[PDB]
Structures are given as C-alpha cells and as structure tokens.
Design a protein around this ligand. Structure first.
Ligand SMILES: *[C@@H]1O[C@H](CO)[C@@H](O)[C@H](O)[C@H]1NC(C)=O
Ligand SMILES: *[C@@H]1O[C@H](CO)[C@@H](O)[C@H](O)[C@H]1NC(C)=O
Ligand SMILES: *[C@@H]1O[C@H](CO)[C@@H](O)[C@H](O)[C@H]1NC(C)=O
Lengths: 125, 188, 51, 94, 399
C-alpha cells in the first residue's frame, strides 16, 4: 500500500513526518531538477519497478504544459494512477484518453463560468 | 469587426483568449471607446501568473478567478493528495476484499489487473476524507474547487477579494471605484 | 406676460411682469405669481406661501 | 433635432458657436445642443470623448488638413456612415 | 548550412525512397535526412525518437502507420510533423501542442461534402446518428456550423446519440421509424456499422422508401459483410500510398527550407535529450510560414492549407454499391461538382430518388376536461357510447 512523491526543479523544502498518523501508506520521496522529458521517462519506469507501489503524486514549478501530455502518455500503461498538485502537470488537460487514469486538481471552464455568473448576480448587473 | 466591438453598449463584458491575443485586443480596444469608465471586464484564469507583472495596455478592473498562491501551501496539498490515495485504497478494500498489487514495469504488454483498473477507477471518484469532499468526475475536476477572486489595484497587483465554496460567496465592499454619478441616498 | 411671439425678429420676449423683472426694471415681484417650470428657467422662486 | 459641435482653434472660432447658440435659444423649436468639444492638434483622449457624442448629427469647422487628420482618428473609433451624418462649411476644398 | 530530417516508418525501402526524393528535391544548403523504424510496444518510442534529435536541429519528422504521440515529445520542442493517417482522432487541435499539420482531411471534414451533396437533390429533412464519444461530437459540431441561416433551408430534424458497442439499438430504431424524414446519416466505427446493418434487418423497413449517406468506414469489409444495397458512400483519392505522400512532404519541406534561408533569426534545438529547459527553434515563425502557401505543386496538394491544412481542395470520390461491390460514379473537386455517368441505383425503387419524406397523416391530439367545452362520460357495455339527440332531432357526434 504505497505512494510516491516527486519534486522536479522545485525548491525542495518539505518533510512529511506526519503520514503514519493519518487514521501502511509509505512514501519514497525523490527530487530531480532536470526538467527533462527523457529523465522523466527513465525515472518513472525506474521508480515504478523499483518502488513496488502504485499511485505517484507530484508537482512542479515551471509551466511548459506539455508535461500533462507526456505524463498522460505514461498513464497509457494502465493500472497506473497519477495525480498532479502544484504544477503537477500545471495548467489543465482539456480531454483524456478513455483507458487512461489521471486527475489534475484544477477548475474546469464551466465552473469558472458559473462563478462569473454568481458574481454578476450578487452585485446586481 | 472590432469596430463592431464598439457596438457593444453594455456595462459588463466577457472575454476568453490567450495572453498575447489579450494584449493585442486590449491595444486595439482602449484606442476605440474601451476604458475603465463605463465598462468592466472578466477573464478566466489563463491570463498569467498573478505575481508576474501584467503588461502595460492591460487596463484597470479585469476581474478574474483562479486558485491562489495561498491555496498552494505545498505541504498541505501533498498531504491531501497522499490522503486521497490512501482513502481510495481503503474504500476499494472496504467494498471488496481484493487488493491492488505492486505492478510490472515498461517491459511488454501485461494487463492482468486491467479490469480491476476500471474497478479501481470506479472508487477513486466518490471517495472522501477529513470531512472535506474531494470528489472527481471522470475528467480531472475537483468537484468542489477552492476558488478565489482577484482584481488589480491602481496598477500594483492582485488582491485576494472573494472566496467561493459550494455556491457560497464571501464578498467585500459592495462598491467599485470609477478610476461623479454614484450617489448614496438615505431613506426610511 | 408669458412667452409670446415677436414681429419675427428673435421670438423670446417675456413681456409684462417678467419683462419688468428680467430687463432691469424691477428687482422683486409680489403678486399672485404661479410656479411654472418655464418661468423657473430664468427666475428664482421663494418657497410656496399659498397653494 | 439633436446634434453637437466640434471645432479646433481656428480663427473665426467663437462667432460660429455664438451664432448657433443664439439661434437655438429662440424659435420655440426645441433644439437640443448635446455637447461642444475642442481639439488642439499641435490627442485622441479628448477625441475619445468624441465617442461620447451619441448623436445622429454632427457639426465640424476646421481646415482641410486637420479635417483629414481628425477623420483618420475618428473612423478608427466608432465614426462611420451608419448611425452618423456630418456637415462642414465651404472651406473643405474645390 | 546543413539541416536534417527524420522518419519513423515500417519498411526500409520506403525510407530509401524518401532519401532519394529529398536528394532529388535539394538538387531542385545541405538537406541530409535520417530515419528509424516504429516500435513494437510504443513506450520505448520516445526514448528511441529523441535520440533521433541527435542532429543539431532535427525538424519535422515523417511517420507512417494509434501512433505514439511523437508530437508530444516533439511539442515540448516546437517541431512540426508530417500528415499520413491524421484522421483516427482530433489531433487537429491546439490541445495537443501546436505541433501537427494534417495535410489530409480527417474523417470529420468528410461531412462537409454531405452538405454539398444535399444541393444536388434539395433534401431538407435529415436524421443524424452519432456514437456518443469524441469523434461524432466533431462530426456534429461541423454539421452545426455548416448550417447557416444568412437570410427555408435544410434542417436536421433529430439527432440520436447512441452508446458505442452496445448491441441493442432497436429502441433507437423504433424511435427512427416514428420520425417523419427519410434520409439517414451514419458515422461511427465499422464494427458498430456492421452491428447496425445487421440490426437494420428489422430496420430495412426503411429501405426501398428511405436512403442514407453513410460515411467512410462502413464501406470497409467488416461492413460489406452486412451491407444492404443503397449505401451511397464516399472515398478519398489516396489510401496508404505513402510514396506519393512522401513526395508531397519533401516538396513542402524543400520550399520550407527555402523559407528558412532568411536569417532574421536562426537557432537550433539542442542535440538530443540533453535536458534543456525551454526550446525555441523559432517554432512560431516556422509554423506561421508553413501555414502560408507551401505549394509543393506535386501530385496532390495543389492548393494552400487551412488551420489544419486539407489543401482546401477535395479529391472526393462518390461510391455506390451495385448490390455487390463498389462503383466510382462521379467526383467532387472541392465544391466542384463533377456529376456521375452511370445510373445511381437506390434501394429497390431503383430509378427514382424518393427525394423528401412521407408527410404523416395520423395525429395524436390531447385535450383537457373543461365543463362547457368538452365532456367526459363512461362508455356502455359494448365499449361504444349511447346515441343521443339534440332537441331538434340532430344526431349528436361523439368520439
Ligand atoms: C539541483 O540543482 C543544483 C544545481 O543547479 C544542485 O543542487 C543539484 O546538482 C541539482 N540536482 C541534481 C539531481 O543534480
Ligand atoms: C433487444 O431488446 C429487446 C427487448 O428489449 C429484445 O426483444 C431483443 O431480442 C434484444 N436484442 C436485439 C438484437 O434487438
Ligand atoms: C502511388 O502513386 C504513384 C503516383 O501517384 C504511383 O506511381 C504508384 O504506382 C502508386 N502506388 C500504389 C501502391 O498505389
């Protein structure tokens, strides 16, 4: 029962020290800073086989939004849920492969439109 | 056609485009009857990183909506993430006594638990934790996203103004500055 | 002396009492003078003292 | 019966506005002078106020070069043939 | 002045022909080219291809036949691509990084001919059919935007999104029969089209009276196995004859490097997966010029690009089933109508086109129970209701 976390090119100021009380969920925290496609690939295929667990979750600072695409193409190899956080494939994925598995922690356009209308109402225009 | 943009005699305007096109259109517009007096604009989150400076022709007002840098307390967010993974694992072991295994690498075609992936995919969306509801549709949507509102001050930066939660709005000032015609009339 | 016509020269006279008030003849009018927004353009009225 | 006046610092200046104003204060016709402006070439901001003129009819008094300049600045900003009409004294050209 | 080109095909002789063609075009500023073969399991594809970026500025790669999204690993670096089988999806979108030019109409664009097709026979009552998922949505959006009301024109009566793969659709067919139109349009997967045609055995009671304009997969063999006769369908001028496509591509890339000759700003991406942060092989300008009249006036692409390419020129070929096999009948060069020469065999009423619909004459009427206007009474034993008379011996009518 595992989870893995990555910080690529990002100010790696974090320590969990409070996961074992979340009531085993076991981390293996890694922090590259190469912002390299190939390095992402070789690590992810490395880290999966090495860290015999599923469901990695990471984040990043830059915003070359192709990371979502590369990561989803990674998720093309099934049973491999991934889950971005700060960048974590920063911006948004407009659509998705069916067989894939991914999430984004990001607001969809329609929700933003609904917020726009709630404002338009609450301030009487 | 942007001349027809002057046909828009409306107080409120909406706009959806990229940052470069935004600068271009704002340039063309501010020249032609597009200003802060008698207008107000709204644009989705894709304008820019708020800390990044905004361009010059980028006028006043420009209410928008996105996450906030404060929302990005990194440790809290990674905690929530590992929590959602763990609670989904617990749920898919509560409704059934089958367990997801460690799997195999980028070696070949091997999809033994592929059917379980769809079954895992099933429980990974209505699973909650810590009282908050961290749910998803099938398209990477936090079904309840912590959003905020921002507008720019004289030229300075973006102010954390309004808070949004489940059709709930925390708002301030009831009032917007015009860069007089607004009169406050008392009654009884 | 409300707004009359002319012999087609300028067509703005205010004859009569308004004439005496506007053209410097007098400086006040005490009389049963109504309140009419036409007259309120060029004159200044006191509060009403008889409805 | 709606219009405006737009002029620019050319001699024989105030006679123009004064004659019209004198004419509109009479005749019991109910004329409505929406606005008078003033441009000084030697800019568009006040000509931005030129967009405040929501009137069907416009008046203008200036020289041919300034006329070209102002028409350039205007046709860019909501000044066209639809929803407008202009009048200019004889000094445009042969 | 050396520039490199790469390829991911399935046959070595194809790549050799490509090299011969590019040398012939450069003879028509070095333009050396490389190549590599596709991958078995598609994951090592990215590692295999970004090592084919090992030459200074590897520009657009050319790939043959779903594929591995090399554009992804290229979009990270703003590198164009080729256009070979650019239909199986909606690649033609700025969601996938602006790294793809199609040059070949993807299946969605096909619908447009259908619209033009209507101008031949003035049909104005059409039923649409779409497989609920991600490509029929494109077909739908295209057909919608092709419905202009710039004014009594055609109007799509009702669209019936059906779930993919589900065998039972007969409820949707009973829905169809209740409709009034007589023109069907089907656009889905060939397996699904076969399922429909089989399930159209009970729906063939549209048949001799009806007509449909099915798309491009449903004339493949897996649909020939259950195709009825009247299956007017479409075809593109070129299938998987990549060699001529290689020719068109090399023409485009030659005129492209000729555009590259200008030295307002030149810069190469790094050689290989070195780990550079950002890439700029002046991608914006490269694409802005590739979208402007490449004009590789060779075999096919004799006209310029759209935002997707498409040569703005249809080499569209109609195809009618002569009850056992296809027949090329007429063609279309864009809007250019080149009518047929043979007899358009429709379903059984083989000579006349039942152009239109069967205006229904049944009517289901609803009312309410209001006292001095209508009246509701219970029937007698025999089901009917008793005859009365008004005071003047007039027989009273009741229903
Ligand atoms: C991260 O960046 C600096 C060098 O710029 C240094 O801490 C370290 O070499 C980098 N990380 C790795 C894995 O090389
Ligand atoms: C579909 O369902 C109906 C009843 O709902 C049934 O009679 C029929 O056999 C099913 N299969 C097909 C192919 O229609
Ligand atoms: C491909 O097209 C070229 C020219 O259009 C032709 O010479 C060649 O025979 C074709 N090959 C096939 C397999 O259709």
């Amino acid at each position: 029962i595992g989870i893995a976390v990555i910080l690529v090119g990002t100010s790696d100021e974090v320590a969990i020290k409070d996961a074992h009380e979340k009531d085993v969920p076991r981390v293996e925290l890694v922090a590259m800073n190469e912002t390299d496609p190939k390095s992402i690939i070789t690590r992810i295929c490395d880290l999966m086989s090495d860290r015999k667990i599923q469901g990695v979750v990471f984040a990043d600072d830059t915003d070359q939004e192709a990371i979502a695409q590369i990561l989803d193409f990674i998720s093309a190899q099934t049973l491999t849920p991934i889950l971005g956080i700060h960048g974590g494939s920063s911006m948004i994925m407009a659509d998705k492969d069916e067989s894939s598995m991914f999430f984004q922690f990001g607001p969809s356009i329609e929700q933003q439109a609904s917020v726009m209308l709630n404002i338009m109402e609450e301030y009487d225009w | 056609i942007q001349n027809q943009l002057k046909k828009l005699q409306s107080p409120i305007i909406l706009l959806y485009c990229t940052k470069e096109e935004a600068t271009y259109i704002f340039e063309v517009a501010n020249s032609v009857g597009l200003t802060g007096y008698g207008y107000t604009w709204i644009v989705p989150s894709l304008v820019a990183g708020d800390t990044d400076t905004v361009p010059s022709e980028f006028p006043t007002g420009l209410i928008s909506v996105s996450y906030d840098e404060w929302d990005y307390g990194l440790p809290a967010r990674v905690r929530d993430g590992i929590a959602i993974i763990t609670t989904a694992a617990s749920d898919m072991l509560s409704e059934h006594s089958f367990i997801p295994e460690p799997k195999s690498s980028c070696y070949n075609t091997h999809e033994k638990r592929i059917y379980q992936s769809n079954m895992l995919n099933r429980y990974l969306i209505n699973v909650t934790f810590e009282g908050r509801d961290l749910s998803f549709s099938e398209d990477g949507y936090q079904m309840h996203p912590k959003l905020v509102i921002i507008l720019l001050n004289k030229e300075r930066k973006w102010e954390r103004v309004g808070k949004w939660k489940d059709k709930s709005l925390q708002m301030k000032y009831y009032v917007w500055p015009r860069m007089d015609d607004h009169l406050s009339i008392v009654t009884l | 002396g409300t707004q009359e016509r002319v012999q087609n020269s300028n067509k703005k006279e205010w004859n009569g009492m308004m004439g005496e008030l506007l053209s410097g003849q007098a400086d006040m009018i005490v009389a049963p003078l109504t309140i009419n927004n036409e007259r309120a353009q060029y004159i200044e009225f006191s509060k009403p003292f008889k409805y | 019966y709606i219009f405006s006046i737009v002029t620019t610092y050319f001699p024989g200046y105030q006679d123009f506005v004064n004659k019209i104003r004198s004419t509109i204060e009479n005749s019991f016709v109910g004329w409505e002078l929406e606005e008078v402006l003033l441009l000084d070439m030697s800019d568009s901001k006040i000509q931005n106020q030129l967009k405040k003129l929501q009137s069907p009819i416009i008046l203008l008094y200036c020289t041919k070069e300034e006329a070209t300049y102002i028409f350039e600045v205007a046709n860019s900003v909501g000044l066209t043939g639809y929803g407008y009409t202009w009048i200019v004294p004889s000094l445009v050209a042969g | 002045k050396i520039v490199n080109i790469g390829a991911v095909l399935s046959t070595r002789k194809h790549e050799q022909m490509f090299r011969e063609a590019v040398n012939q075009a450069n003879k028509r500023i070095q333009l050396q080219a490389t190549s590599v073969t596709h991958k078995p399991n598609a994951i090592q594809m990215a590692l295999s291809v970004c090592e084919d970026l090992i030459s200074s500025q590897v520009y657009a790669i050319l790939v043959s036949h779903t594929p591995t999204p090399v554009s992804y690993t290229a979009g990270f670096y703003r590198i164009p691509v080729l256009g070979l089988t650019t239909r199986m999806s909606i690649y033609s979108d700025k969601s996938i990084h602006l790294s793809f030019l199609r040059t070949v109409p993807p299946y969605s664009h096909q619908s447009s001919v259908w619209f033009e097709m209507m101008r031949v026979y003035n049909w104005n009552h059409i039923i649409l059919l779409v497989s609920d998922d991600h490509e029929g949505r494109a077909a739908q959006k295209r057909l919608e935007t092709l419905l202009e009301e710039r004014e009594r024109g055609p109007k799509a009566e009702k669209v019936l999104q059906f779930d993919p793969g589900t065998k039972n659709v007969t409820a949707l067919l009973m829905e169809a029969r209740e409709l009034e139109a007589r023109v069907i349009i089907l656009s889905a997967s060939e397996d699904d089209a076969a399922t429909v045609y089989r399930a159209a055995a009970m729906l063939d009671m549209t048949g001799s009276g009806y007509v449909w304009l099915v798309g491009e997969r449903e004339i493949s063999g897996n649909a020939l196995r259950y195709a009825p006769d009247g299956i007017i369908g479409l075809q593109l001028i070129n299938g998987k004859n990549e060699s001529a496509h290689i020719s068109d591509a090399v023409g485009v890339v030659a005129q492209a490097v000729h555009e590259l000759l200008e030295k307002e700003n030149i810069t190469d991406p790094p050689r290989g997966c070195v780990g550079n942060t950002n890439i700029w092989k002046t991608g914006p300008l490269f694409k802005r010029v590739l979208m402007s009249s490449k004009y590789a006036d060779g075999v096919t692409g004799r006209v310029e690009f759209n935002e997707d390419g498409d040569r703005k020129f249809a080499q569209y070929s109609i195809m009618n089933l002569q009850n056992r096999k296809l027949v090329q009948v007429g063609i279309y060069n864009g809007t250019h109508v080149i009518p047929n020469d043979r007899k358009i065999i429709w379903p059984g009423g083989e000579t006349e086109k039942p152009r239109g619909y069967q205006m229904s004459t049944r009517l289901k009427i609803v009312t309410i129970h209001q006292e001095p206007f209508v009246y509701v009474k219970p029937t007698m034993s025999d089901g009917t209701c008793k005859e009365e008379f008004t005071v003047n011996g007039d027989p009273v009518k009741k229903v």
